Amino acid sequence: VYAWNRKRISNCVADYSVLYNLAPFFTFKCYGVSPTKLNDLCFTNVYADS
Amino acid sequence: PTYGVGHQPYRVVVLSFELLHAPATVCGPKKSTNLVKNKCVNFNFNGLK
Amino acid sequence: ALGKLQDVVNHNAQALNTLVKQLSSKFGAISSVLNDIFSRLDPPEAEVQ
Known about the structure:
The structure is cut from a larger assembly and holds 3 copies of chain A. In chain A, 0% of the residues lie in helices and 20% in strands. The first copy, chain A, has strands at 6-9, 12-13, 46-49.
């Protein structure tokens, strides 16, 4: 947590239908957007903090 | 492994999005179609429906 | 000289202009475009916006 990896993800095709067939993903809370309907929006560059 | 669920490790990824005036590069899995002009249709551009 | 007739034209023109410009207000919501709200937000809480 004190060295959280921040990966800049750009020039991608964000397919959010691949993280649900994996292990049970809990607490999928999106602040500002809906959990679904994310496959129709074009973002400029996202950041993944793991 | 024998501790309660409140103390078990949980991996967490935070996906921070951005929306500014620039050509977008991260879209969703939607196959784009051809451009048919001079006809009232439903446009579905990057962020304008 | 012909001001008593141009005044009504200017009044109706500005009444239409302000009526069009009132669509540029959020009225306490997050945006003024409905396609920007229906796309990001789901119907459950999009009603309050």
